[PDB]
Design a binder for this molecule. Structure first.
Ligand SMILES: Nc1ncnc2[nH]cnc12
Ligand SMILES: Nc1ncnc2[nH]cnc12
Lengths: 209, 209
């Protein structure tokens, strides 16, 4: 019932994004167009583009669906479109390769619909034990599964982590102090980037509580 | 010949992005889809999405062209596509409104090709004196023109700032100490986020020097 959670800072994102770009430099892959996987790849896409000198970034939104009875997972491009990237070297970017389901779909999608000369894949992180497909480049190998909390995800991640606690509670409990204590117990996070009272307020606004 | 340059940190981006989101919360605009203007809007787009709870982000790349003899400016969507966003509330996001040429184009483009129920515009910064169009939301009003150096633009911006200095001189064996001095004199930057020796190396790699 504990979940391993790792808080990632902006300094780490800069550091990881730069290291990722350096691998691509060293490999002398000449990137013309970066395709970001939305939403997780937008930020790393931009930073890699800055270091490598890539002017053209596009994005595709990938949704993840689960069938209730079978527990079957399915990944889908939402708002799919076509453009002509023939004559271009494409780099697909996302934040993390977990199962590898996302970069697998992105790669197929891009090859069929953008028809680029070449395609490669890159993510900041790569979970060795979990990944069915290995991205062509990654900045950091992860050998033990954890949930990575990115700085562009602090609100949503904390909202979901709070929710996971609240639905266990047999009797409602507003004592923010209980909530904070559980957060430490369950997630190992003594100081959430966004304070839990702010998270609660926002959950109310959204009609989540 | 001096250029007013403002270095923007990540802490400022987080702060600005959040303030921008708060204005949108307060205004009770219910955003379904964020359309980011690439490349400048990708990062702010992501952060705003996190704070507001928006799952769908798309992007359009906007180029800026200048006619040599006439000095006529023209902004153009590159790799244009169409998708169906009817029944959706769209928020278009960019880093800065300078002339306003970009958000003007984006807005027209989006209404004509995505066909959303409603469209609004947002940027982190807005230059009052320069802007011919005004974004619906902005985090910070700028009353005196400056070049804003964003954290996702440090390499490219510094490369261009270095170049502007090098073309004034004839003597072609680059003195780094001279270069650093000029950087302070021309831009007011004593401590560039990326060290100029790294910038120079990268300019070489790209065949810029
Ligand atoms: N392990 C993980 N951490 C953060 N984001 C993810 N998205 C999919 N898997 C993830
Ligand atoms: N004044 C400015 N600062 C940073 N980026 C820009 N892009 C267009 N105008 C800009």
């Amino acid at each position: 019932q504990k979940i391993p959670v790792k808080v990632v800072t902006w300094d780490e994102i800069v550091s990881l994004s730069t290291k990722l770009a350096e691998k691509i430099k060293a490999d002398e892959y000449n990137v013309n167009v970066i395709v970001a996987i939305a939403r997780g790849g937008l930020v790393p896409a931009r930073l890699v583009a800055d270091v490598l000198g890539v002017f053209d970034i596009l994005s595709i939104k990938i949704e993840h669906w689960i069938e209730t009875a079978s527990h079957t997972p399915e990944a889908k491009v939402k708002y799919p479109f076509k453009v002509d990237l023939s004559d271009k070297n494409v780099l697909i970017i996302d934040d993390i390769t977990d199962t590898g389901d996302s970069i697998e779909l992105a790669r197929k999608y891009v090859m069929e619909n953008f028809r680029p000369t070449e395609v490669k894949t890159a993510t900041l992180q790569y979970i060795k034990p979990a990944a069915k497909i290995i991205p062509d480049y990654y900045a950091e190998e992860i050998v033990s599964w954890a949930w990575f909390m990115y700085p562009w995800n602090y609100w949503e991640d904390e909202i979901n982590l709070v929710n996971k606690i609240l639905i266990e509670r047999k009797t409602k409990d507003i004592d923010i102090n209980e909530l904070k204590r559980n957060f430490v117990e369950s997630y190992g996070i003594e100081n959430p980037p966004i304070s839990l009272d702010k998270i609660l307020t926002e959950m109310k606004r959204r009609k989540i509580v």
